[PDB]
């Protein structure tokens, strides 16, 4: 029932169009890293259960912190490019905030 109602609510144009620039709330920050994103679940190697590929999980030096900081920005740039490309073609989904 929820899906059926949502489909014909979308069909009626009750959803506002998204801006040309991605909302600030869609970006990723340290609070989201603490929330559990990038968790890949079970795995064999320590390097193969974090999507960023960092090994040390108990004692970490500043060198790992710098790499994590750079990789977060890399992922943010990739997401921004993907969003721009999708928006230009006019194929964005009818979602907002966390769903997007």
């Amino acid at each position: 029932d929820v899906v059926g109602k949502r489909a014909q609510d979308i069909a009626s144009g009750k959803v506002l169009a998204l801006p040309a620039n991605m909302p600030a709330d869609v970006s990723i920050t340290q609070a989201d890293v603490t929330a559990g994103i990038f968790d890949l679940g079970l795995g064999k190697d320590a390097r193969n259960r974090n999507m960023l590929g960092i090994q040390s999980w108990v004692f970490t030096s500043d060198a790992d912190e710098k790499a994590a900081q750079a990789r977060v920005s890399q992922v943010n740039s990739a997401m921004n490019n993907e969003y721009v490309y999708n928006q230009q073609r006019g194929s964005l989904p009818a979602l907002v905030g966390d769903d997007l």
Binding site: G13, L16, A17, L18, P19, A20, Q88, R89, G90
Partner: peptide, 28 residues
């Protein structure tokens, strides 16, 4: 859901992508 001039600005679309982009600009 438009104010009689947004419709004027939207009726120029010639393809689906153009309409999608116009609907985005109208929101900003």
């Amino acid at each position: 859901q438009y104010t009689a001039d947004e419709l004027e600005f939207l009726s120029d679309a010639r393809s689906s992508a153009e309409l999608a982009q116009r609907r985005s600009q109208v929101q900003d």
